[PDB]
Amino acid sequence: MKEFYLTVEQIGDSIFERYIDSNGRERTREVEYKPSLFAHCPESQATKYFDIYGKPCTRKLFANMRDASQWIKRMEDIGLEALGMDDFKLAYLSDTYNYEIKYDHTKIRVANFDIEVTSPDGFPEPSQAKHPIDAITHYDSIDDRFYVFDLLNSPYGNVEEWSIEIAAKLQEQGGDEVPSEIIDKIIYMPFDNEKELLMEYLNFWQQKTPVILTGWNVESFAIPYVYNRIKNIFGESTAKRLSPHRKTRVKVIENMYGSREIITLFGISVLDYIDLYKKFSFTNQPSYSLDYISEFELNVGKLKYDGPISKLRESNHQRYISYNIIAVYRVLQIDAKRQFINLSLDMGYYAKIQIQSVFSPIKTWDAIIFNSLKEQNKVIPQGRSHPVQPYPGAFVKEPIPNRYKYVMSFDLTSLYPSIIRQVNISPETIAGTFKVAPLHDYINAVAERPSDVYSCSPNGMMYYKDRDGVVPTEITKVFNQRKEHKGYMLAAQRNGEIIKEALHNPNLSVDEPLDVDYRFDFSDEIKEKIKKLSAKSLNEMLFRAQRTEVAGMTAQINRKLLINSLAGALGNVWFRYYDLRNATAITTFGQMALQWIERKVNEYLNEVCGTEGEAFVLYGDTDSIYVSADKIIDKVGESKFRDTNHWVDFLDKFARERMEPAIDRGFREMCEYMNNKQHLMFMDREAIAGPPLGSKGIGGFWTGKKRYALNVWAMEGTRYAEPKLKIMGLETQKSSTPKAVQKALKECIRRMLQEGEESLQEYFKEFEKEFRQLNYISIASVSSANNIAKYDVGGFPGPKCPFHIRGILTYNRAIKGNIDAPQVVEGEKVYVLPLREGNPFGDKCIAWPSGTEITDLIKDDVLHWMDYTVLLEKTFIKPLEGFTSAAKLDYEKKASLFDMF
DNA sequence: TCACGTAAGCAGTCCGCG
DNA sequence: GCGGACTGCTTAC
Ligand SMILES: Nc1nc2c(ncn2[C@H]2C[C@H](O)[C@@H](COP(=O)(O)NP(=O)(O)OP(=O)(O)O)O2)c(=O)[nH]1
Ligand SMILES: Nc1nc2c(ncn2[C@H]2C[C@H](O)[C@@H](COP(=O)(O)NP(=O)(O)OP(=O)(O)O)O2)c(=O)[nH]1
Ligand SMILES: [Ca+2]
Ligand code: NA
């Protein structure tokens, strides 16, 4: 097989590399690496090296990396550019692996672990590590085994061995119900004291040293805790055995609020799953506890138990160990579903970077571009420093707040990347500038044509049409790779709806799920075979189709994130190819494109509908336009449609055969106006929305920019069994909105969209009289808690104290002195409740850590003093008032005339 | 919340002007 | 009592 690296590090004058060799074996090598950098030379100093602008360079090969670094300093002091890849790690990888890396994951050691530290005095700070680590579960992906290290004797109590037999028994038999699929993969190791356990773990670590090290919160808790514990017991030098090259570094990670401290183990790639999840999941969660995320992703969660965790090992060592095993397992199940480790490996190997650099799109693109130019012997420019500066972004149309009955949407394919390719935008393709007319003049085609020679953007930039730019070239590759995965996602999605349709009245036979690939549309052979299946098999296939879809989703959307991030990187001062001219050339073109086609779409539909000056385009945002289809439906007549599927078919054909060709002529003309290099504004039908035929639903509404709801029957090529609510921006979509209120407002919107005013009024009346009986966590708001200390004065709110911070201070006063009350953590999230006047907490709200029950100390008080009236007014009634006033509905029967003033 | 971007909405506090 | 300026937080694209 071809070799590929596992990890790379620079330690002084050498590169340390762990890799997989031609035979498939893991090896390690230290290289006295000799890097090269470049300097501009006279046009006569020949050679084959040129900068991206075509100016010649001479190569300078250094004895070692210290020399090359010192040379960079002296050039800065002279005032000349030092060109070439200054991150020597990346130049090494690029030299050693001068080919496309096909990596084999089964040879990569992915370690997944979690620890437990019993602590009587509150949260065990890993800086101090002053409590014995009493359990470790370490999953190895090569061996496919969970290694469990279990401390029998501790100053906090001595316990019996964990029973694998009881662990396997059901909950209803007194057991822990550790899953059947992993019960045989557990290797259990009790130890009579903590020193023996840690010393065995360290040796185990040497035999099976992780390449990728993951888990939940491992970077901020588990790793710094194991490191410091071992350091406190055995010394700094034994602790460094956690690194294959015996070098560590205490990294201080700073943000806009404070500083935290992680441990860098050289020669290991740490991918904390909570970081992978925050970056790649596209969710904003009210809590990031493993149990909460696990329940959201898997519908199950962490093992349950009685009393505080601090007392679990004494009272139930059995459940305590089982719980630790399951926690590790839950992370593995989340990864089987979302596939972020796999994603990380693909991007890392494609870009040729350290795997943990996938958190940095700028690092990723710098390496792809560098590898790309090196193939043609071209030399990358030096990083330069730049003041941060704002620049303009996308266009968003002010919609007239209203109900909108029938709507069709259209959207452009990967807008910013497509613009980069169409216009040919790149650091090396800039050809000059032209004198700019105001933007509306380009939108209306009345301004002078910018160029007959260069490709233009309406911000005044001109680009060469004839030469290739590394940005368009490299963005095209990643965009093309995305296509396949996106196609898998949509196929699974279309197959989802086939399963769902057969679920309405399923056969009741005794059968099994069909063996198919969900990545490709279902053949007619199996569509027929699906109609015979039972509810058990069908729901099972629904699970597999949905899993295939999520995996497809993760693959496609994160490649889109990566290509979108190139457009943004051109606007970030740390990018090597930072240039506000380029970044603005993309966004300005984008805002001309959308408004251009709004004009063309209005022109076309006025012609076809026989009208003058109607606004058919009711809204647009960045890459999308929404078209009112009322008059189109009125041309045929609602009484002439048989059912909902009929008018949806009608609008579908009309968009496909009438509008898209007109829109395509629209964009071709724009392409010629700007004299671009390649036409790539490809805008097609997205959503078809409206009320069900014969109902009183209003179909859809807008309240303002980025705030709207639609009852959708079709999205791209997916036709839906039952209509789907597409809600954007409204409180139902916001993590800060209380769970039960999201559910209630969603059901209010569905009744508005699909059933009408009267149905909305029945539901509202009912929710109003019943909601006081909802669980307090489900009606609590959520907020991130930043700058708690900034507004903290004597443990009381200082000036301008935001409401949710006031809540945290009230909490702190209530749990003061109680060392075992859960503390609010700066930066994390809090539930927030309003309190009635005269309450014992001394303020108008209380907050506590999200994803948790409020401590039993103060729970009964909070429940007695929660302010339902204020809560109902702020989180339910006020937003509902916005929807219904926009949609021109009433959530309460009005006695007379719908008056005002 | 650890070197992709801008646009823009809502909650809540405080102040200047009635 | 109301509107604007502002911080803080959240989403859309
Ligand atoms: N092209 C290029 N190379 C770079 C850059 N930064 C660092 N390097 C490094 C990468 C390379 O290590 C080195 C020169 O790249 P080769 O021409 O591909 N190697 P050669 O043909 O000289 O091999 P032999 O010894 O057989 O003649 O400069 C850069 O910006 N561009
Ligand atoms: N810099 C940057 N620009 C972005 C980002 N997201 C959008 N834009 C700008 C640049 C993009 O080209 C443009 C369109 O966004 P789509 O890529 O189509 N993400 P959507 O979820 O809306 O599409 P789909 O229908 O696939 O879910 O908005 C981002 O994360 N970063
Ligand atoms: Ca889009
Ligand atoms: Na929007």
Q: What is A840-889 written as a DSSP string?
A: TTSSSEEEEETTSPPPTTTHHHHHHHB-HHHHHIIIIIHHHHHHHHHTT-
Question: With a 7 Å cutoff on the CB, does A394 touch strand B?
Answer: yes
Torsion of CA A275, A280, A284, A286, to 10 degrees: -40
What is the Cα–Cα distance from A10 to A598, expressed in whole angstroms?
Answer: 54
In angstroms, the CA A646 to CA A3 distance is 58
* C-alpha count within 13 angstroms, C-beta hemisphere, residue A43: 2
Closest-lying ligand to the alpha carbon of A394? Answer: 2
State the distance from the centre of ligand 3 to the C-alpha of A541, rounded, in angstroms. Answer: 29
Phi, psi of A222 (to 5 degrees): -50, -50
Residue A630 neighbours by CB distance under 10 Å:
18
Degrees to nearest 5, angle at CA A237 with A233 and A242: 90
A784 C-beta less than 7 Å away from strand B:
yes
Nucleotide nearest to A708 (CA to C1'): C12
Per DSSP, which regions of A373-474 are E strands? 378-379, 402-403, 407-412, 430-433, 455-456, 461-463
Secondary structure string (H, E, C) spanning A467-514: CCCHHHHHHHHHHHHHHHHHHHHHHHHHHHHHHHHHCCCCECCCCCCC
Asked if residue A288 keeps its beta carbon closer than 7 A to nucleic acid strand B, the reply is: no
Q: Is the CB of A560 under 6 A from ligand 2?
A: yes
Does residue A728 lie within 7 Å of nucleic acid chain B, judged by its CB? no
CB distance A105 to A6 below 8 Å: no
Residue type, A626: Y
**CA–CA separation, A274 vs A786, rounded Å?**
19
Q: Which nucleotide is nearest to A704 (CA to C1')?
A: B9
The torsion angles phi and psi of A304, rounded to 5 degrees, stand at -80, 165
| Identity of residue A495 | N
Number of H helices, E strands in chain A: 27, 33
The residues that bridge with A154 in the sheet, in sequence order, are A157
Q: For residues A338 and A350, give the distance between their C-alpha atoms in angstroms, rounded to a whole number.
A: 20
Integer Cα distance of A325 and A319 in angstroms: 10
Alpha carbon distance A74, A68 (integer Å): 10
If one counts every other C-beta atom within 10 angstroms of the C-beta of residue A208, the result is 15
What is the enclosing helix (H) or strand (E) of A685?
Answer: strand A683-689
- Structure tokens, A900: 């005002």
Rounded distance between C-alpha atoms, residue A590 and residue A423, angstroms = 11
Cβ atoms of A224 and A261 closer than 8 Å: yes
> Is A68:A102 a contact under the CB 8 Å cutoff?
no
DSSP codes, A331-387: HHHHHHHH-HHHHHHHHHHHHTS-GGGGG-HHHHHHHHHHHHHHHTTEEPPPP----
Of A750, A438, A470, A703, the residue nearest A582 (C-alpha): A470
DSSP calls for A716-784: TTEEEEEEEEEEESSGGG-TTS-HHHHHHHHHHHHHHHHT-HHHHHHHHHHHHHHGGGS-TTTT-EEEE
Pocket probe for ligand 2: among A586, A623, A728, the residue whose CB has the most ligand atoms within 8 Å is A623
CA distance A111 to A208: 9
Question: φ, ψ for residue A654 (rounded to 5)?
Answer: -65, -45
User: Residues A390, A608: contact at Cβ < 8 Å?
Assistant: no
Which residues are bridge partners to A403 per DSSP?
A701
Angle ∠(A371,A414,A388) on CA atoms, nearest 5 = 65
Ligand nearest to the CA of A622: 2
For β-strands A269-270 and A212-214, DSSP reports them as parallel
- What is the C-alpha radius of gyration for chain A, rounded to an integer number of angstroms? 31
Check: CB of residue A621 under 8 Å from CB of residue A705: yes
The integer distance in angstroms from the CA atom of A851 to the C1' atom of C5 is 35
Q: Whose CA is nearest to atom 8 of ligand 2?
A: A564
Strand pairing partners for A410? Answer: A625, A685
> If we measure between CA atoms, which residue out of A817, A804, A806, A801 comes closest to residue A855?
A817
Output the six-digit token pair for A86: 């200054």
Is the separation of the CB atoms in A742 and A731 below 8 Å?
Answer: yes
What residue ranges in A233-339 does DSSP mark as E strands? 248-254, 259-265, 269-270
CB atoms within 10 A of CB A120: 13
| Closest by CA position to A358, among listed A371, A376, A341, A333 | A341
- C1’ B11 / CA A845, Å: 14
Q: Is the distance between the Cβ of A393 and the closest atom of strand B smaller than 7 Å? A: yes
What is the bridge-based pairing of β-strands A212-214 and A145-151?
unpaired
Question: Taking Cα atoms as reference points, which of A662, A671, A656 lies closest to residue A593?
Answer: A671
A383: which nucleotide lies closest, measuring CA to C1'? Answer: B3
Q: Which nucleotide is nearest to A784 (CA to C1')?
A: C9
- Max CA-CA distance within chain A? 92
What is the sign, positive or negative, of the torsion defined by CA atoms of A287, A292, A297, A299?
Answer: negative
- Strand C contact at CB of residue A480, distance < 7 A: no
Residue with nearest Cα to nucleotide B14 C1': A800
Ligand 2, atom nearest to A567 Cα: 1
| A784 CB neighbours strand C below 7 A | yes
Query: CA torsion angle for A649, A654, A657, A662 (degrees, to 10)?
Result: -150
Q: What spacing in Å lies between the alpha carbon of A412 and ligand 3's midpoint?
A: 7
Q: Which of residues 548-567 of A touch strand B (CB under 7 A)?
A: 561, 564-565, 567
Q: Which of A428, A412, A463 is nearest to A592 (CA)?
A: A412
Protein-to-nucleotide distance from the CA of A56 to the C1' of B7, whole angstroms: 43
Tallying the residues shown for chain A, one arrives at 901
CA A899/CA A2 separation, integer angstroms: 77
Alpha carbons A369 and A286: distance in angstroms, whole number: 38
Tokens coding A494 = 């279309």
Reduce the DSSP state of residue A142 to 3 states and report it.
coil
- How far apart CA A789 and CA A869 sit, in angstroms, is 30
- Distance between CA atoms of residues A122 and A112, nearest Å: 26
What per-residue string of b and e applies to A543-580 under the rule 16 or more CB within 10 Å gives b? ebbbebbebbbbbbbbbbebbbbbbebbbeeebbbbbe
The tokens describing A374, both together, are: 């090196």
Q: Does strand C come within 7 Å of the CB of A360? A: no
Q: Which nucleotide is nearest to A844 (CA to C1')?
A: B12
Nearest atom, ligand 2, residue A557 CA? 26
H or E element in which residue A116 lies: strand A110-116
Within 7 Å: CB of A733 and strand C? yes
**Phi (first) and psi of residue A504, to 5 degrees:** -65, -55
Question: What is the sign of the dihedral through the CA atoms of A439, A440, A441 and A444?
Answer: positive
Tokens 């994390």 appear where? Answer: A828
C-beta separation of A83 from A381 below 8 A: yes
Identify which of A689, A699, A730 has the alpha carbon closest to the alpha carbon of residue A880. A730
Measured in angstroms, how far is the CA atom of residue A707 from the centroid of ligand 4? 7
Q: CA A396, CA A414: separation in Å to the nearest integer? A: 17
Which residues surround ligand 1 with Cβ inside 6 Å? A 36, 84-85, 91, 95, 370, 373-374, 377-380
Structure tokens at A762: 């029945």
Backbone phi, psi, residue A634, to 5° = -65, -25
Q: Which tokens sit at A331?
A: 């992370």
**CB of A796 within 7 Å of some strand B atom:** no
Give the whole-angstrom CA distance, residue A657 versus residue A102.
Answer: 43
Name the resolution in angstroms.
2.5
Distance CA A848, CA A823 (A): 8
**Whole-number Å distance between alpha carbons of A438 and A435:** 10
Neighbours of A623 (CB within 10 A): 19
Which positions of chain B lie under 7 Å from any protein Cβ?
1-14
Q: What residue type is A417 in one-letter code? A: P
Q: Which nucleotides of C are covered by protein (CB under 7 A)?
A: 7-13
Q: Is the CB of A623 under 6 A from ligand 2?
A: yes
Give the pairing of strands A110-116 and A212-214.
parallel
Question: Do residues A745 and A734 make contact, with C-beta atoms less than 8 angstroms apart?
Answer: no
The closest residue, in CA terms, to atom 16 on ligand 1 is: A377
d(CA A230, CA A569): 41
Phi and psi at residue A461, to the nearest 5°: -90, 145
First-to-final CA distance of chain A: 80
Confirm if A624 and A644 have CB atoms less than 8 A apart.
no
Report CA(A759)–C1'(C1) in Å, whole number.
37
Question: Using a 6 Å cutoff on CB, does residue A489 contact ligand 2?
Answer: no
- Way the structure was solved: X-ray
> Distance between CA atoms of A538 and A118, rounded to whole angstroms?
45
Local structure of residue A184 (DSSP, 8 states): G
DSSP for residue A449: P
Q: Say if CB A351 and CB A212 are below 8 A apart.
A: no
Going from the C-alpha of A3 to that of each of A10, A21, A105, A118, A250, the distances in angstroms are 20, 5, 13, 44, 32
CA of A800 to C1' of B17 (A): 21
CA distance A434 to A451: 8
Secondary element (H or E) of residue A431: strand A430-433
Pocket test for ligand 1, best of A374, A378, A576 (most atoms within 8 A of CB): A374
Token pair of A774, please? 């909802």
Strands A135-140 and A110-116: antiparallel
| Subset of residues 820-859 in chain A with CB less than 7 angstroms from any atom in strand B | 827
* All domains in chain A, ordered by first residue: 1-108+340-382 (3.30.342.10), 109-339 (3.30.420.10), 383-468+573-729 (3.90.1600.10), 469-572 (1.10.287.690), 730-774+867-888 (1.20.1280.300), 775-866 (3.40.1820.10)
Report the protein residue whose CA lies nearest the C1' of nucleotide B5.
A568
CA of A577 to the centre of ligand 3 (A): 25
